[PDB]
# Entry
Amino acid sequence: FRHAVLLHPSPDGSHVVDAWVTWAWRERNISPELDPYLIYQTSKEGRVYPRPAEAERAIWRDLDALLHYGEDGNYRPTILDNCTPLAQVPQEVLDSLRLRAFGFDQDGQARDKQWFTATTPAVLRWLADRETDDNENARIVRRITLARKAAEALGRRLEKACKEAWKESNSGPWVQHGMSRYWAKAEPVFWNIVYDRPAQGYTPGMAGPGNAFNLVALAAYDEVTGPYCERPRVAKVVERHRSTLFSNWTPK
Amino acid sequence: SGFLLRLAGPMQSWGEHSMFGERDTLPYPSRSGLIGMFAAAQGVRRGDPLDRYKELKFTVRVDRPGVRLVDFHTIGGGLPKERTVPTAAGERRDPKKATIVTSRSYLADAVFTVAVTGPEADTIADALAAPYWQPYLGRRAFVPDPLLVLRRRVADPVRELVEAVPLPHRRVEEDAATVLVDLIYETRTLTVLNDVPLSFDSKSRRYSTRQIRVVPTEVPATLVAGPGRDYQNKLFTYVKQCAE
Amino acid sequence: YILQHADALVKRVSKLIVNEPAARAALRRGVGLAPEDPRMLAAHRVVAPYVPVVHAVERAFYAVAAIMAAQPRSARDQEAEARRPNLGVSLAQAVFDKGLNADSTEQRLHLIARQNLDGVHRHLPRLVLYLRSDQVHIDWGILIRDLARWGHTPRHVAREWVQDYHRTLETLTRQAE
Amino acid sequence: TFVDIHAIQTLPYSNINRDDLGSPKTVVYGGKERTRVSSQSWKRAVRHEVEARLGDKAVRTRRIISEIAKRLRERGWDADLADAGARQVVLFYLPVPAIDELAAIADEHRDAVAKILPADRITEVLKSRNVSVNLFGRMLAELPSTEVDGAVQFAHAFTVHGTTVEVDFFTAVDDIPKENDHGSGHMNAGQFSAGTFYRYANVNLDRLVENTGDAQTARTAVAEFLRAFLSTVPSGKQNATAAMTLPDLVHIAVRFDRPISFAPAFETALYGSDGYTLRACQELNNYAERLREVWPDDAIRGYATVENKTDLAALGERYDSYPALIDAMVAAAF
Amino acid sequence: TFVDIHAIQTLPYSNINRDDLGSPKTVVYGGKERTRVSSQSWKRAVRHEVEARLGDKAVRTRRIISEIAKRLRERGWDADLADAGARQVVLSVGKKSGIKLEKEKDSEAPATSVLFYLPVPAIDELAAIADEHRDAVAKEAAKKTPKGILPADRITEVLKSRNVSVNLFGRMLAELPSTEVDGAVQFAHAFTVHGTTVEVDFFTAVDDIPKENDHGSGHMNAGQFSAGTFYRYANVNLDRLVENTGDAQTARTAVAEFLRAFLSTVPSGKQNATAAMTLPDLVHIAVRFDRPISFAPAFETALYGSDGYTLRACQELNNYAERLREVWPDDAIRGYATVENKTDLAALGERYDSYPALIDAMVAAA
# Structure
């Protein structure tokens, strides 16, 4: 470990009175055979780094827990890639497997922001089991998979939208508000689509997510930067980056 | 036995899992919060045993979900170089770096109809009618609804949440009934979260995990109020027959 | 709902102005003015039977009908040559094709989109007559229904003209590879 | 035993406390946007004004050294050399019970006035008030002190009608011109908003006076508190948008069961094109009427108003002025 | 210790300070649109007039390097030695690598990022401190990346040099929190007392020389204007002003000249073609010893017209000051002047004879 702590015992033996926290190793060393629990993403120049945590994703409970659906495009731990699928030899515990996530977002130097746990909703299993119809058992899970994939897809597409909008407006501070309000607002829509209830933008009945939270992303993005797009400069740049949310956008 | 609190007002924020600057709230009330409110209405100082508040049941019907807002909150700024919030060692920070900035989130413009069912519910109600400390909703600065206790005495108050309780105006199709409203009971559970309160003392806050299951129920459309000024009116006439 | 009445007016007025001058002269003198101004007391004869059943809706009908009758003879001779766009799209098609000033049209578009119900009626007529001076194909039914919805919130009709204008500008530029 | 205070105050075109990006803080109540002033703002603005007077009413009037009369004088400790400390109790402001220690642990020792360093025992002025710690929670520069709270519940102030922010395009002009003029200093945009805010606060003397004692000292603290609550206005961008004002309606009520706010009265936002003070006054009246006739109670109500047009029945007996209202209500509070 | 000043001033058909597109700035007050004049514009006119009389020239600028280099070139330094010198004066005041600068456009001296606010003798003294180290500055220019050599203590003490305009209006400088002086005058925006919509003027600059066949204008456009009766208000915190200035006679002169410039001045926004110069039709100075107070809420309910607005505004300000006076009783001083002798305004105090007389007697009573 990179640290070295010690506990000073109390005479009772069931209490700590003092402690020591300091460096245990001073020469750098990166661990080979990357951690199977985390999700890793590659940047330019060849370095591979873990995707950092985001309190903005914990604005709704158990958001990352649902990664058991998907999966997802490079966004998947190897431990799952070697224990959750069928290329392994579990037989019936796999039909009750649930994911959990322990996240503690922090700055890489010494400042901490927040922790949060995320256990997947067993209700999403209940819905798939309660109907006992093969075609409906597959249509439901297809609807959750679809809604989740597209949900995070527009989440990251909105992140780059706000990063380029603010980084180009001045020639950022909008990502925090935009994302926070975007997930906070877009998750009740998710639960709205899973129970095939009339959601904003699109009514039940259709195949997938029906392209609804995309409209939720237009709402959050349009309001977080709305009061600031008055003069034509900010208006044209904000709009130029606002013409991306309109994709995928598969029509009726 | 039991009574029906009406969780409403300008702002609500039931926090959880946040022990740092950034504070967040849940999209629905947490029993730790409202049990803290009952405890504040009965006069139990932090550190006292909260066993009395065990054996209670809280099903909550969400009227409207309400929208989440982030409250920026700086504390200690602008003050001179010799007045801020001290450090543990006692050595203050430089005034350019002295204030601490917390961005505490909160839930705004939402109204919940909780249904308390417990053995001590009658004294709890009579405590909310006259408390030994300002009762709040989530945090001190949030002032509760005047009609904090909608109905004081009702047998099987859950059935009262399923029928004959006013709801705020929402889009209702023509001659349509069976309008869905979500209520949370506590298999097929939605999530687990630290709600059960074990100790409130500031020296060692201690909580535990608790199950929660959100069941979307159907209610007849005869409860949706009108466009404006109708909802508060209908709930007033609803609280009028409380004596009867 | 209103768009249908809009298409009725645009139909008979679009054939009316070209087919007989009395109504074209009774309507021409009503551009950019109130529906009760005495100078427009001669336009009711033609427009009054089409308004449905707020004043924003009638203001829309009378104002744009007058606009349709006050366009130059060139714009009517081309208007009578024989999803769908707002007038913002018309502005972009005007700058990209007919060579108008971009930096000016942008500030005139945000100048008009930033005003109140009465500012859109005073600033609008010269802008649309300038666009028809450059003979850009503007759709009238959408223009009126837009002005009709311009009175409940000054955000839901402006933002869509501005964003639609910029959108079609960068699509006309990206399409020019 | 709960002093509730409501007040309608119309602030002009300004920006009291901005958000994380310049805009003024806003809540969305009853479906509509509403600019708001945080409770902390209107707290540090009242407190910062209270001490400015209470903690100054007064080193030249009541004084702290002016003691002995009950521990150093009518006690025997040099009835004439009383300045014994006095001068020895110096090398914030307390009430009276915690002052017993002031004249108490101020005796014994020797003393050494014959020509004075034991303060770790008197320093505990805040540990036991410092009334400014029983009214409002702990200080802001001292570690906790057994009484972290509280008492004075303070509510956020939101508008009574939907108000959208408005962009104030502004620019800085440099005074040294080159041969290419109009090169102003720095173009920019600052958001402002105006409107008629509703404000509310509670003072729980019940669980208050205990922490202190002398009901007279408590009475002075609550009276100056109410006057500071109406008087003060935050200090945000006032030097650029002078928005100093007084509440157009002031309603103090003394309730013996539980405090109550009138915020839901302003749930349905008010549409305008007219003024908002009169409509807000008569609407607060109406809400007080139905709420009063639905939750009957024997409470005290009083209110002042800067408009003699309407007659507010449900608000009590219309006093003539703010300080008269405050005096008669603090007196009526016990 | 708070000198409050109120004034009703009706401006004719004009456009004082336009928005980013020409239109006049408007508030949405009491539900209705209301043209307004920003506070910073009047504050600028006021300062330029006050400093005009009191020839202090409290120059606010960015090009301090350009003028310091000019001062050094006047005193014998070579062009490059002056430029590098000034850059040394500015580069020796921040934490390290001096204050932040901007991209140099020409070979001309660059412009700092922040706005400085100093009098001209302050810049002169800065050039003096730069001249005291001729050799050192020349030696630093020989390097590729020079550093600070100036005695940051005295130059930092020179940047703190105040002025009448610096005393009243205050200064800000992020990279030097030690020089930040707080303003003593709360200046408010001026909004109309009645809902006013904007009105478009259609203008066509025609070319004088004819064209062969046809003749059309050289350019046609339309500018937004508006007329109306503005309400204006300002506060002068005597206590803090005497604290900044230090003496009481200089402070008294600064507040007297402030008030006279506040009534007299009018901005310079499109005045060359509108001639909108005017005087306040009502002036009310009150000296309060507890807190400053504005009469803005009196003008919340917009006023309908077809009649005049001066009399209604005057008597309504009277009414609000009377009832407001009997609701917040206080031992304060009240005085007022008026350009209309029809009604008699009692609640505004004792009617002095003229604006300068009113200001003299009120500043005296303070």
Remarks:
- The longest helix of chain B spans residues 31-42.
- Residues 1-244 of chain B form one domain.
- The radius of gyration of chain B is 20 Å.
